[PDB]
mmCIF file of all heavy atoms in Angstrom:
data_model
loop_
_atom_site.group_PDB
_atom_site.id
_atom_site.type_symbol
_atom_site.label_atom_id
_atom_site.label_comp_id
_atom_site.label_asym_id
_atom_site.label_seq_id
_atom_site.Cartn_x
_atom_site.Cartn_y
_atom_site.Cartn_z
ATOM 1 N N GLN A 3 68.496 4.198 4.817
ATOM 2 C CA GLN A 3 68.239 2.998 4.043
ATOM 3 C C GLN A 3 69.285 2.738 2.974
ATOM 4 O O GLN A 3 69.572 3.739 2.200
ATOM 5 C CB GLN A 3 66.770 3.057 3.463
ATOM 6 C CG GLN A 3 66.519 2.003 2.370
ATOM 7 C CD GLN A 3 65.135 2.118 1.805
ATOM 8 O OE1 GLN A 3 64.258 2.628 2.401
ATOM 9 N NE2 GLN A 3 64.990 1.535 0.681
ATOM 10 N N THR A 32 80.786 3.176 2.404
ATOM 11 C CA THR A 32 81.359 2.325 1.364
ATOM 12 C C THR A 32 80.681 0.971 1.403
ATOM 13 O O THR A 32 80.758 0.235 2.306
ATOM 14 C CB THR A 32 82.849 2.176 1.500
ATOM 15 O OG1 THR A 32 83.182 1.764 2.881
ATOM 16 C CG2 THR A 32 83.656 3.480 1.253
ATOM 17 N N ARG A 90 73.854 -12.125 4.070
ATOM 18 C CA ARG A 90 74.341 -13.296 3.289
ATOM 19 C C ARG A 90 73.092 -14.045 2.546
ATOM 20 O O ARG A 90 72.082 -14.177 3.157
ATOM 21 C CB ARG A 90 75.065 -14.259 4.108
ATOM 22 C CG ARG A 90 74.323 -15.151 5.117
ATOM 23 C CD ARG A 90 75.122 -16.335 5.723
ATOM 24 N NE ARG A 90 76.144 -15.939 6.653
ATOM 25 C CZ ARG A 90 77.410 -15.695 6.345
ATOM 26 N NH1 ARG A 90 77.832 -15.817 5.095
ATOM 27 N NH2 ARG A 90 78.241 -15.255 7.302
ATOM 28 N N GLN A 152 90.268 -31.044 -36.118
ATOM 29 C CA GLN A 152 90.526 -30.960 -34.733
ATOM 30 C C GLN A 152 91.140 -29.627 -34.279
ATOM 31 O O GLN A 152 91.750 -28.943 -35.136
ATOM 32 C CB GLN A 152 91.449 -32.173 -34.250
ATOM 33 C CG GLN A 152 90.743 -32.969 -33.195
ATOM 34 C CD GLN A 152 91.581 -34.094 -32.712
ATOM 35 O OE1 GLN A 152 92.103 -34.923 -33.506
ATOM 36 N NE2 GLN A 152 91.760 -34.230 -31.396
ATOM 37 N N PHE A 273 44.208 -25.329 -61.518
ATOM 38 C CA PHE A 273 42.972 -26.175 -61.388
ATOM 39 C C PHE A 273 42.409 -25.859 -59.965
ATOM 40 O O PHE A 273 43.122 -25.960 -59.052
ATOM 41 C CB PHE A 273 43.329 -27.647 -61.507
ATOM 42 C CG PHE A 273 42.153 -28.606 -61.282
ATOM 43 C CD1 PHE A 273 41.393 -29.067 -62.313
ATOM 44 C CD2 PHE A 273 41.825 -28.958 -60.004
ATOM 45 C CE1 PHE A 273 40.227 -29.865 -62.004
ATOM 46 C CE2 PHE A 273 40.755 -29.821 -59.678
ATOM 47 C CZ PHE A 273 40.032 -30.311 -60.761
ATOM 48 N N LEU A 551 69.986 -14.183 -69.346
ATOM 49 C CA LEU A 551 69.947 -15.576 -69.817
ATOM 50 C C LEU A 551 71.422 -16.027 -69.463
ATOM 51 O O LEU A 551 71.781 -15.573 -68.353
ATOM 52 C CB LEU A 551 69.616 -15.650 -71.311
ATOM 53 C CG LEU A 551 70.349 -14.729 -72.237
ATOM 54 C CD1 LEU A 551 70.119 -15.223 -73.777
ATOM 55 C CD2 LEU A 551 69.777 -13.278 -72.138
ATOM 56 N N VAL A 577 67.178 -27.483 -56.156
ATOM 57 C CA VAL A 577 67.702 -28.161 -55.029
ATOM 58 C C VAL A 577 67.079 -27.624 -53.784
ATOM 59 O O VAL A 577 66.999 -28.398 -52.805
ATOM 60 C CB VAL A 577 69.331 -28.079 -55.013
ATOM 61 C CG1 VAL A 577 69.895 -28.819 -56.214
ATOM 62 C CG2 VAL A 577 69.754 -26.685 -54.888
ATOM 63 N N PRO A 630 43.634 -18.932 16.355
ATOM 64 C CA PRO A 630 45.114 -19.303 16.236
ATOM 65 C C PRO A 630 45.612 -19.129 14.763
ATOM 66 O O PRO A 630 44.866 -19.446 13.842
ATOM 67 C CB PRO A 630 45.144 -20.746 16.721
ATOM 68 C CG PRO A 630 43.750 -21.243 16.205
ATOM 69 C CD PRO A 630 42.774 -20.080 16.351
ATOM 70 N N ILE A 699 67.488 -22.729 -66.250
ATOM 71 C CA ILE A 699 66.145 -23.056 -66.580
ATOM 72 C C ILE A 699 65.191 -22.522 -65.493
ATOM 73 O O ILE A 699 64.032 -22.158 -65.784
ATOM 74 C CB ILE A 699 65.953 -24.544 -66.990
ATOM 75 C CG1 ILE A 699 66.721 -24.871 -68.323
ATOM 76 C CG2 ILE A 699 64.458 -25.034 -67.109
ATOM 77 C CD1 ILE A 699 68.161 -25.144 -68.200
ATOM 78 N N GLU A 779 60.346 -39.372 -89.154
ATOM 79 C CA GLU A 779 60.464 -38.107 -89.873
ATOM 80 C C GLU A 779 61.044 -37.075 -88.977
ATOM 81 O O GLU A 779 60.677 -36.931 -87.829
ATOM 82 C CB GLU A 779 59.044 -37.656 -90.337
ATOM 83 C CG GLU A 779 58.048 -37.286 -89.234
ATOM 84 C CD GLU A 779 57.747 -35.878 -88.983
ATOM 85 O OE1 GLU A 779 58.447 -35.190 -88.072
ATOM 86 O OE2 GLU A 779 56.819 -35.251 -89.550
ATOM 87 N N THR A 976 65.547 -68.707 -6.033
ATOM 88 C CA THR A 976 66.859 -69.163 -6.373
ATOM 89 C C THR A 976 67.507 -68.261 -7.444
ATOM 90 O O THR A 976 68.703 -68.084 -7.410
ATOM 91 C CB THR A 976 66.838 -70.606 -6.822
ATOM 92 O OG1 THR A 976 65.556 -71.141 -6.918
ATOM 93 C CG2 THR A 976 67.698 -71.421 -5.860
ATOM 94 N N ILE A 1005 76.211 -70.440 0.562
ATOM 95 C CA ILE A 1005 75.741 -71.549 1.349
ATOM 96 C C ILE A 1005 74.348 -71.929 1.142
ATOM 97 O O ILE A 1005 74.043 -73.059 0.859
ATOM 98 C CB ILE A 1005 76.122 -71.377 2.822
ATOM 99 C CG1 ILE A 1005 77.640 -71.380 3.003
ATOM 100 C CG2 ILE A 1005 75.457 -72.510 3.633
ATOM 101 C CD1 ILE A 1005 78.007 -70.574 4.216
ATOM 102 N N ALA A 1094 85.015 -72.182 -16.836
ATOM 103 C CA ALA A 1094 85.402 -73.339 -16.097
ATOM 104 C C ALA A 1094 86.772 -73.990 -16.553
ATOM 105 O O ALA A 1094 87.480 -74.575 -15.772
ATOM 106 C CB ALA A 1094 84.397 -74.456 -16.142
ATOM 107 N N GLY A 1095 87.052 -73.870 -17.861
ATOM 108 C CA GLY A 1095 88.272 -74.327 -18.453
ATOM 109 C C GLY A 1095 88.305 -75.512 -19.348
ATOM 110 O O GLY A 1095 89.356 -75.941 -19.735
ATOM 111 N N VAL A 1112 73.647 -66.380 -37.056
ATOM 112 C CA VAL A 1112 72.932 -65.527 -38.007
ATOM 113 C C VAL A 1112 73.851 -64.405 -38.516
ATOM 114 O O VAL A 1112 73.821 -63.366 -37.899
ATOM 115 C CB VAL A 1112 71.634 -65.066 -37.525
ATOM 116 C CG1 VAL A 1112 70.873 -64.236 -38.543
ATOM 117 C CG2 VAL A 1112 70.773 -66.223 -37.000
ATOM 118 N N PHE A 1133 55.344 -60.600 -21.913
ATOM 119 C CA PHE A 1133 56.681 -61.097 -21.942
ATOM 120 C C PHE A 1133 57.093 -61.789 -23.387
ATOM 121 O O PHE A 1133 57.799 -62.761 -23.470
ATOM 122 C CB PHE A 1133 56.990 -62.184 -20.877
ATOM 123 C CG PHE A 1133 56.634 -61.706 -19.487
ATOM 124 C CD1 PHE A 1133 55.759 -62.376 -18.735
ATOM 125 C CD2 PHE A 1133 57.184 -60.541 -18.971
ATOM 126 C CE1 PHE A 1133 55.403 -62.020 -17.435
ATOM 127 C CE2 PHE A 1133 56.945 -60.102 -17.686
ATOM 128 C CZ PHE A 1133 55.963 -60.764 -16.891
ATOM 129 N N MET A 1145 71.996 -63.400 -24.866
ATOM 130 C CA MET A 1145 72.671 -64.586 -25.275
ATOM 131 C C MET A 1145 73.852 -64.321 -26.210
ATOM 132 O O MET A 1145 74.842 -64.989 -26.102
ATOM 133 C CB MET A 1145 71.583 -65.566 -25.801
ATOM 134 C CG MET A 1145 71.210 -65.500 -27.252
ATOM 135 S SD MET A 1145 69.846 -66.630 -27.610
ATOM 136 C CE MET A 1145 69.497 -66.050 -29.234
ATOM 137 N N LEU A 1195 76.848 -54.934 -21.283
ATOM 138 C CA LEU A 1195 77.829 -53.996 -20.724
ATOM 139 C C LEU A 1195 79.039 -54.814 -20.135
ATOM 140 O O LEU A 1195 80.179 -54.294 -20.248
ATOM 141 C CB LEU A 1195 77.216 -53.167 -19.582
ATOM 142 C CG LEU A 1195 76.250 -52.115 -20.067
ATOM 143 C CD1 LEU A 1195 75.270 -51.888 -19.016
ATOM 144 C CD2 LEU A 1195 76.966 -50.883 -20.412
#
Side-chain angles (χ1 to χ4, degrees):
Chain A
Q3 163 180 342
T32 53
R90 73 168 70 269
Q152 243 180 306
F273 172 94
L551 48 163
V577 295
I699 291 87
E779 63 106 269
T976 8
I1005 292 154
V1112 181
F1133 310 123
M1145 83 189 171
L1195 291 152

